Amino acid sequence: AFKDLFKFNKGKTTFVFIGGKGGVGKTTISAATALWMARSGKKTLVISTDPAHSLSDSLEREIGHTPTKITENLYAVEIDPEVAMEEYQAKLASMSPGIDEAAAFDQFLRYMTTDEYDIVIFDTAPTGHTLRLLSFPEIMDSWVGKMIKIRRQIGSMAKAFKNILPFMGDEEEEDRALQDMEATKKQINAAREVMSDPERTSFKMVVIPEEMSIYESERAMKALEKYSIHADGVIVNQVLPEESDCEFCNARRKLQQERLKQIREKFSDKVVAEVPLLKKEAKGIETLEKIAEQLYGEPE
Amino acid sequence: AFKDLFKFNKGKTTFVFIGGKGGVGKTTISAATALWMARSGKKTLVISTDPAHSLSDSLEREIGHTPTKITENLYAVEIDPEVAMEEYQAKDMLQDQMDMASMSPGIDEAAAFDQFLRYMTTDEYDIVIFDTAPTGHTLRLLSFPEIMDSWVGKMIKIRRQIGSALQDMEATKKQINAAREVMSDPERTSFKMVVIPEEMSIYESERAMKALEKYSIHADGVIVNQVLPEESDCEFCNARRKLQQERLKQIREKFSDKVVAEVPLLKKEAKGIETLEKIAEQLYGEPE
Ligand SMILES: Nc1ncnc2c1ncn2[C@@H]1O[C@H](COP(=O)(O)OP(=O)(O)O)[C@@H](O)[C@H]1O
Ligand SMILES: Nc1ncnc2c1ncn2[C@@H]1O[C@H](COP(=O)(O)OP(=O)(O)O)[C@@H](O)[C@H]1O
Ligand code: ALF
Ligand code: ALF
Ligand SMILES: [K+]
Ligand SMILES: [K+]
Ligand SMILES: [Mg+2]
Ligand SMILES: [Mg+2]
Ligand SMILES: [Zn+2]
């Protein structure tokens, strides 16, 4: 019933963030889930916000900043902050730290605005920077709100003597600019509100059965349910299969099964599902669809 | 001879960045390396720049923002950007700005760069090892000095033009450029890349090695971690080892201008000082 953790509302894009520690399979799960959604008839966009993109390696397809068709109903984007800058200036250094998260938030605004997709899936950077991304809207909201407030105060002062001294300011134009800033703020705030709406946005946590991943994600889940991001599902990836006759495997599997117990105890309030480690690398559409089919069942 | 890739100049801090894709073992290798340097008599600081810190989990010790003793000759830091900010303001248009900036995207990389500035100055450690964030944000860190330089400059001329401490901002600008020189100086600074024998780690790290070129970062060594040992001989292991061994050949081909070393996958998780020392010893030999 992991597949039931995805809700859809006709005409309102569903958002899903796939997150977790480095190397646990975020990109693998994102690409498999997106392919599954596409086969299910959902118009799907999967977007990589990791500045070292891997979605293209994972699907084995060239993918750009603008939506790239992968297959019927599946489109993909690897965010390029240089291009994101251009699309910003045009609307109203592309290499400074923080730019990747600002450009990722811009993508969220775009698709929230158009509602062109049934579901948008974010393939996120490793934990620490994705928590920055997810807390960025509230910060952007406060900042824009403060700029507007200050700008209004300076305006009030500036025109306070128009009845005593010649005041040459253009109030019309000033009022339009304030109105434009307020509309930008309303957009930022609307997005913060969609992100913490469990009916629109969810976060699926990927872990592997190893303590360093478990502990990181346990800290992350706490930080998430602080920001009111709905984090309802945990996927345990790279689980060694029973078919392990050898002594090296047996030691590792025995330890993984104890970690699975810890996982089910630490995330006891969540739905937990497993994805087995394959005999080969998880890479390539056919392999990704088989992972999706075992996790979610056959596409509807 | 992998250990020969670490050059030391007494009185002058050696810098090492350990980088790579998520999950490949940067923290494990950083911590194993740091313990080895310390056992070897080098006064060693290992600094996590990954905003989700794992050094504490790896070394199994509580570590703070303040250098934290781990063993003789070894200290550790998990950067806390808020403490870095009050520290930085210690040396309401601004207040709200500082508190907001202290939680904003990019603050982690700025705070990491501040650590570099602090120790390149006071050569107090023989070696400082950066346990970096995964590839993509570590590139932002490594290109940050050029951006900082330009930015401070722009800020300079703009403060002047405004009239109604330019002597200080001006110093920090030279500090920044002195740091770039240290960073691109192969006698002082190196980058070790960690990869696992899987295509997604290989391609990401090949691309990253190219972006470091542009920055003149000296990358001289590749560590291939989590290599399945030969003993494993069940059907499942053999199939995986056979693939890894083809990936090792690709790694050696693609990083042919670098020295390549392997670290075996253990039968348990790599963590705790005892296990980490075994890894350093298998990788670098006994200390001195
Ligand atoms: N279930 C699996 N079985 C086998 N290999 C896997 C599995 N899931 C992920 N991988 C491999 O593990 C590595 C990390 O997966 P990746 O999706 O890149 O992770 P992240 O996006 O979290 O960095 C890749 O080499 C991928 O092929
Ligand atoms: N050689 C190894 N053998 C077994 N487990 C390992 C080995 N190297 C690392 N690990 C395990 O792999 C996972 C990731 O290692 P970690 O150092 O956190 O990576 P990164 O810093 O690149 O995120 C951890 O659970 C760690 O214990
Ligand atoms: F997943 Al990491 F450093 F913890 F890349
Ligand atoms: F290592 Al990644 F997404 F590639 F965490
Ligand atoms: K990546
Ligand atoms: K981490
Ligand atoms: Mg990924
Ligand atoms: Mg790490
Ligand atoms: Zn085996």
Cα–Cα dist B254/B260, whole Å: 11
Partners of residue B134 in chain A, C-beta under 8 Å: 22-23, 50, 52, 125-126
Answer whether A151's CB lies under 8 Å from A181's CB: yes
Residue the block writes with tokens 């991001």: A229
- CA torsion angle B158 B161 B162 B166 (round to 10): 60
Cα–Cα dist A105/A203, whole Å: 15
Measure in Å the smallest separation between the Cα of A82 and chain B Cα atoms. Answer: 13
Answer whether A164's CB lies under 8 Å from A83's CB: no
Compare all CA atoms of chain A with the CA of B60 and give the residue at the minimum distance: A212
Domains, chain B, with CATH or none? 1-288 (3.40.50.300)
Cα→Cα distances A212→A23, B25, B64, B270, Å: 12, 11, 18, 9
Separation of first and last alpha carbons in chain B: 15
Structure-solving method: X-ray
Q: Tell me which residue of B54, B1, B63, B65 sits closest to B28, measured CA to CA.
A: B54
Separation of first and last alpha carbons in chain A: 14
- CA torsion angle A98 A75 A22 A206 (round to 10): 120
Cα–Cα dist A52/B22, whole Å: 10
Cα→Cα distances B97→A139, A148, A202, Å: 10, 14, 30
In A124-228, which residue ranges form alpha helices assigned H by DSSP? 127-158, 171-195, 211-226
Facing residues of A15 across strands?
A120, A201
B residues 234-253 near A, CB within 8 Å?
A: 234-237, 239-240, 243
Flag whether B21 is marked binding: yes
What b-and-e string marks burial along B131-169, b requiring 16 or more CB atoms within 10 Å of the CB?
A: bbbbbbbbbbbbbbbebbbeebeeeeeeeeeeeeeeeee
What would the two tokens of residue B95 be?
Answer: 């207040």
What would the two tokens of residue B111 be?
Answer: 């705070």
Cα→Cα distances A42→A16, A110, A117, A163, B114, Å: 14, 19, 8, 62, 47
Cα(A273) to centroid(ligand 4), Å: 20
Resolution for this experimental structure (Å): 2.1
Cα–Cα dist A238/A275, whole Å: 6
Nearest-by-Cβ selection for B236 from A132, A211, A249: A249
Q: Tell me which residue of B149, B216, B211 sits closest to B184, measured CA to CA.
A: B216
Measure in Å the smallest separation between the Cα of B24 and chain A Cα atoms. Answer: 7
Cα–Cα dist B249/B225, whole Å: 14
